[PDB]
């Protein structure tokens, strides 16, 4: 089995380790090149799309998958996630353990085989036109294009994670899509001519165009700051304010005065961040909500009328009643005043889900007080003013509360962003700013080492 899959294992391309330590400058340039390639592929449509006027079945997963419908990045970061999950599954199942080359290659072969299956499913969901009217040739060509694009995504993520980059493909591509969306909504030259005349979609471009055209400057300013058809400057101000507050709360940290005992003189500080799980609660809550949205839409487009389906969230698209409605951010402050109960339920759901996801994530990923105490025992580190047996007790005092309250605060920031109507949404803003802060942490760590 292993011998016969060895060739198919090592036939796909692999990234060569730098064998050096790439300077931060070259790493930044290569990260920029990687995100440029991703963005270029996100704007190039697939060949063979007979019709793209259908409703996107996976619209709610585009932000969390860094996907763009009908382009070369329809799957987005799906190949990376598929390869990682299949690798973890086969490792936990103890199917397999110079064995690393076979192990790393196998996740590429199996990862793309599942990726091919995903592309076939995507084609058959009714997008890209009717697959019966597309023909086997056009569907095969679309599947080949998606397979090659997923291979390229895997190569880019491997480049980033093997040393020509500043992290992982997942975070980079998600943050890149979010930032591109915000900057587009702020600076787009798209003009829609409904009613009065041409109106630039970009909020700042809208400001300048309205001031230039309208004779009444004050009315132009009011329209620019409170335009509802297209993004306004008030949304941009809310986005900047949310950036500022999330940055401020991301800089919060509890500094443990640790001290080495195995080797003397290695004093230091162990920072326990308030956002202990960096945007993991946001990722998990967004994935839960997006899965519920997709399932509810599928069930309400095929089994419409059932009591359970109608209770899972009715739809007009945006939910108007049900679980998917009480899990959805309100449209505006007027919606908050119209139905206070929904706003309260949404706030409670956001805070509770984020806190629960944060604590369960520390317990799952092994950042709990027990694991940190075990690490402290391994490296021989002890806290300056505490004994060698109270290491777990102090970690039990800080870390669980830190994780729960960091989840609570990140959910509260997401709720605040949603209420203020910031561009990019609460999830999007939180994800983007947390990923950029991860890059900033990498920079400061490298600078301190240098």
């Amino acid at each position: 089995f292993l011998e016969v899959i060895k060739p198919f294992c090592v036939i796909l391309p692999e990234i060569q380790k730098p064998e050096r330590k790439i300077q931060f400058k070259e790493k930044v340039l290569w990260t920029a090149i990687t995100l440029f390639i991703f963005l270029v592929c996100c704007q190039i449509p697939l060949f063979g799309i007979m019709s793209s006027d259908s409703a996107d079945p996976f619209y709610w997963m585009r932000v969390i998958l860094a996907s763009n419908r009908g382009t070369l990045m329809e799957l987005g970061i799906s190949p990376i996630v598929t390869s990682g999950l299949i690798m973890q599954l086969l490792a936990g199942a103890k199917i397999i353990e110079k064995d690393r080359a076979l192990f790393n290659g196998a996740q590429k072969l199996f990862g793309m085989i599942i990726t091919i299956g995903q592309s076939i499913v995507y084609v058959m969901t009714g997008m890209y036109g009717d697959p019966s009217e597309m023909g086997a040739g056009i569907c095969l060509l679309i599947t080949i294009q998606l397979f090659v694009a997923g291979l390229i995504v895997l190569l880019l993520d491997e480049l980033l994670q093997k040393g020509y980059g500043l992290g992982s493909g997942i975070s980079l591509f998600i943050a890149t899509n979010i930032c591109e969306t915000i900057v587009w909504k702020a600076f787009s030259p798209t003009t829609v001519n409904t009613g009065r005349g041409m109106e630039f979609e970009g909020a700042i471009i809208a400001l300048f165009h309205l001031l230039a055209t309208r004779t009444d400057k004050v009315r132009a300013l009011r329209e620019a700051f409170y335009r509802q058809n297209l993004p306004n400057l008030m949304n941009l101000i809310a986005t900047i304010f949310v950036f500022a507050v999330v940055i401020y709360f991301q800089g919060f940290r509890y500094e443990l005065p640790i001290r080495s005992t195995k080797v003397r003189g290695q004093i230091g500080i162990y920072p326990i961040k308030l956002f202990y799980t960096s945007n993991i609660p946001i990722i998990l809550q967004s994935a839960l909500v997006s899965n519920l949205y997709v399932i509810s839409q599928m069930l309400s487009a095929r089994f419409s009328g059932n009591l359970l389906v109608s209770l899972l969230g009715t739809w007009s698209a945006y939910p108007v009643g049900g679980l998917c409605y009480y899990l959805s951010p309100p449209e505006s402050f007027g919606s908050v005043l119209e139905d206070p109960v929904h706003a309260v339920v949404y706030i409670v759901f956001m805070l509770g889900s984020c806190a629960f996801f944060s604590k369960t994530w520390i317990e799952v990923s092994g950042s709990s007080p027990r694991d940190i105490a075990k690490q402290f025992k391994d490296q021989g580190m002890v806290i300056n003013g505490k004994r060698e047996t109270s290491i777990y007790r102090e970690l039990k005092k800080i870390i669980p509360t830190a994780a729960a309250f960091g989840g609570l605060c990140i959910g509260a920031l997401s709720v605040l962003a949603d209420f203020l109507g910031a561009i990019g949404s609460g999830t999007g803003i939180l994800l983007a700013v947390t990923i950029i802060y991860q890059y900033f942490e990498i920079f400061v760590k490298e600078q301190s080492e240098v």
Partner: peptide, 7 residues
């Protein structure tokens, strides 16, 4: 299909 089974 969906977050995070293939998707």
């Amino acid at each position: 299909x969906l977050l995070x089974l293939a998707x």
